[PDB]
């Protein structure tokens, strides 16, 4: 009957840790997102069509 107490404390602590991790991930993504997007869009726009190497004549 008395063992049920620790569940709430463990859940609260791990939720706080998860919140810390999510905030860190969000901060890093916001920091380094614009250059990633610019590179991705430049690479998508760059087409450079070419035939298969196995094609001849």
Residues lying near other proteins in the complex (CB under 8 A) are found at 43, 47-50, 52-56
Minimum distance from residue 16 beta carbon to other proteins (Å) = 19
Minimum distance from residue 6 beta carbon to other proteins (Å) = 16
Query: 5: helix, coil or strand?
Result: helix
| Pairwise CA distance, residues 28 & 33, whole Å | 8
Minimum distance from residue 35 beta carbon to other proteins (Å) = 18
Report the residue number, 35 or 52, with the smaller CB distance to other proteins.
52
The residue behind tokens 């069509």 is 49
Length of the chain: 57
């Amino acid at each position: 009957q008395a063992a049920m107490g620790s569940q709430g404390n463990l859940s609260a602590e791990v939720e706080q840790a998860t919140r810390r991790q999510v905030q860190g991930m969000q901060s890093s993504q916001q920091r380094n997102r614009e250059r990633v997007l610019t590179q991705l869009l430049g690479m998508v726009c760059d087409v450079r069509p070419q035939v298969h190497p196995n094609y001849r004549i």
